[PDB]
Amino acid sequence: GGGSIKEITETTQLIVKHLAHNGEEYSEVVKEISEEMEKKGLSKEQVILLLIHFLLLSLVKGLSPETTKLLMKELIKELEKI
Numbered sequence: 001g002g003g004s005i006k007e008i009t010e011t012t013q014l015i016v017k018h019l020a021h022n023g024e025e026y027s028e029v030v031k032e033i034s035e036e037m038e039k040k041g042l043s044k045e046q047v048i049l050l051l052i053h054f055l056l057l058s059l060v061k062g063l064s065p066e067t068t069k070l071l072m073k074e075l076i077k078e079l080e081k082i
Helices: 006-019 023-039 044-060 065-081
Strands: none
Touching (some): 023 044, 023 065
């Protein structure tokens, strides 16, 4: 439901640090993206969904950390409208 998402965030950072040559640059994106999700009041379930969405953009689709950050920011905005 709600609460802190730092545990979910730190796990995602560690996941992407391990599976990407530029994992550190992705981890910083996870940090900035997670703080925006907790700012926008998104639920834990939305955070996990979006963090897994970030993992698939970065690690599966091969999108740069800057690209994924832009897409995650636009997805967070779309979520707060609903």
